[PDB]
Symmetry: D2
């Protein structure tokens, strides 16, 4: 396989049963890592993901947990160490979103998205960094961001804020813990071909509208994001910390400016 | 009298009793505006500020409120509309922070800073914009941010995250409500001579170390920030929206690289 | 009379005979400053502008010069010092551009845009700062940039490169000369109603397409930019250095994401 | 080896005989690519680099050329196609630098650095993109930037401007050519252990001063940059375009802010 330094590494992935999380689970399995799959409530997909990792070459467990609940996050990292012996890579991938006019967005709805998308990643990063520091492990944190840590998002002010927050969180933790060999990085996916988007992307006109926002002209495959994750987690990225690596087919480069407009 | 277009505008300012909030209250008083001073804790400070505002040429009331409470923020804008007739400028300035190694930061302490610094500004911004939309007013929002929406801040991951989130919140709302002529901007102060820092700046070795990180060589005066607020609220800044305007004596330009070291 | 501290300051402006340069010349005239108008080509335009400046309440001369020629830039600052006594504000505003597919752009055409847009501003900035250092003056430099120091611009790779370079040039000089109290900032205009665009904006389908990329919904008026220049040169912006201040009706906030598309 | 899709790819590297360029030559050799080594005047190192690529598993040629000369750049890409049959990856790595107070920097010296660091990369990128477009190859451009496309650099205003320019150049070409499957990216190295730095890094106090600017606490090894180059060139980075990937041990995260200062 590709990244040999990843063989037998313990990798925890929140929301790891579907979409980007699953594709990362499987790719780390292809690298013969030991994967810990978190999931909110869909056991069967988690079980399916578990089997894919094993069938690709990895060991795997599944663990139920809500990332808005501190004990579930604490429990997740502890379960990983109990079961597999250690922790090497922490991937905070859970996320929720819904469109609402911003002046109409409720406080409860703002909070749900903030708690899940930002606070969940803080909790996960914290619990991982704690463990690395306590045990002198030069570990690795990958936080799942979005093109929307840079691209503003009308109707999704909670989501955009959550990721803008995630960016400074990541950069801060990277600076703070860089002298301990602990690396912390964001991945910024563009529009990706996942479960949440299956409905939209079936419609030919909505698919084309989305593709028109992508300079490379196609919706990303989750494996292309997983490729970035493997790289970042590996010792090939040894001198890379506190960055956001956008995997968006050019979306942050301002798609409305194609062909020299404006 | 600088910005004549500000005379008799209604300006709400959270945390307006001390520091930068007070400096801004006074300045909008100098422009003969109608200032609503929100405060949480110390009525005697708010009363003392209400006074400077009246002396400077303006009108003023004081309103008690906790920015982490939705009813309090809703009440504040409604009080401003009752008392002065309308709303023109909403300034979300309330902020808290404390040093903790990140791997030791509690969820409650993380939440308090996020709730106060980011969510308070979201509720502030929402309630103002809601009023602007419904009443066809080309209003204005100033969100008080920090060099730390760009500069990472070890021991202050909660603070950094809250301002990175504030940046994307501001940018989203600016984009979402630009077609209505409603403008939304951030101010990014560096090290400023305010109450919060009075401890730090008394210690002459600490004052010097802070000063060694400001290229311009001095700690910022609170009125230098209020000058930026006056500009941004004014019709002089009519084409300016979605920005962060740093008032930092060069701090975002990387202190460690002065004279060339690298 | 807005910025009283500007009265009788010496302000040099390259490309000051038309467009944004002219709007800025007039504005500093309204502030009763002493404006030196550089021009390359059309004396009758420069003379016509010299006039608006004198009518607006200020003093003015006109100086012919090509900003790609070192002797011309050196001459211009020396002429300003001869004629008015000193220098206070240096504004590097000269700019050229033309659409070419990037793989078809000639070296000479690349060089002309770089020489004019970036190097001219370097020479401008150098000669002004040189004068500020030697004579202990807390002077000011405004470099005229573009949304395209941040927005990439296919068919205009030379232009985009020149402004990305201008951003780092400005930031470096701001940091290097901050301890001397010399401030250096950029302005970043979006689509502005100027001579260069008069062609484009006559075509009603073109005017509309450009307008559809401005969140605020209108093409910028040149005086909206001069208002930013007046602010930045003034002592109101005393703590503001090393920044880019975008005056773009929201254009850097990603036009394609209005109403939520993505 | 690691990236199998890189086997037999034609990779052109400017300044490829020493430092970062050499380390990239060798690493692509380890991937069994065919490497074209450009060099300015040091044949023996070029010859040595050539042999290292072959000894690692690759084919290699060397070609003399000054990147400030258009015909040498044109010649380089043509020589690559003649010799090896095609062109897949273009790496623009040439660079020069020297410290000068910015108000004292000569026009000739500014130009030398601009012509070499920015214009050279434009010429190389152009010649490569031309070839990809003419032949429907989904090719790859890597432009060698620096932490100084983001970090300002007193005494090196020409260098900083050159890389700020490079950033918008890269982003622009990425947007322009993304619909042709052509990817364009920057690598942003921090302080690296190369020939140009051997003198400085021998001195224990200068080595420590530099290491104090690096959060990870060590000077990067050229192979760590070469690892980023292999990743970016490979189809593992298939959805990654127009980015700058900093490999700097945390240097862009503001080293003066370690331990919660300011």
């Amino acid at each position: 396989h590709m990244y040999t330094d990843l063989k037998d590494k313990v990798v925890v992935i929140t929301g790891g049963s579907t979409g980007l999380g699953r594709a990362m689970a499987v790719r780390f399995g292809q690298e013969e890592a030991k994967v810990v799959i978190n999931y909110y409530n869909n056991e069967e997909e988690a079980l399916d993901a578990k089997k894919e990792v094993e069938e690709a070459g990895g060991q795997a467990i599944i663990v139920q947990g809500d990332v808005t609940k501190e004990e579930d996050v604490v429990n997740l990292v502890q379960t990983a160490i109990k079961e597999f012996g250690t922790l090497d890579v922490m991937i905070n991938n859970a996320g929720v979103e819904n469109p609402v006019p911003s002046h109409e967005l409720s406080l409860d709805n703002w909070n749900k998205v903030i708690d899940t998308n930002l606070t969940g990643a803080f909790l996960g990063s914290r619990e991982a960094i704690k463990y690395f520091v306590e045990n002198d492990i030069k570990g690795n944190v990958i936080n799942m961001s979005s093109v929307h840590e840079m691209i503003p998002w009308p109707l999704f002010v909670h989501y955009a804020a959550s990721k803008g927050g995630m960016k400074l969180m990541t950069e801060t933790l990277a600076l703070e813990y860089a002298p301990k060999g602990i690396r912390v990085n964001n991945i910024g996916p563009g529009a990706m071909n996942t479960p949440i988007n299956a409905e939209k992307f079936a419609d030919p006109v909505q698919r084309a509208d989305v593709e028109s926002m992508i300079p490379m002209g196609y919706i990303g495959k989750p494996e292309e994001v997983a490729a970035v994750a493997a790289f970042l987690a590996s010792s090939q990225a040894s001198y890379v910390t506190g960055i956001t690596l956008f995997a968006d087919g050019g979306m942050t480069k301002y798609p409305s400016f194609q062909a020299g407009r404006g």
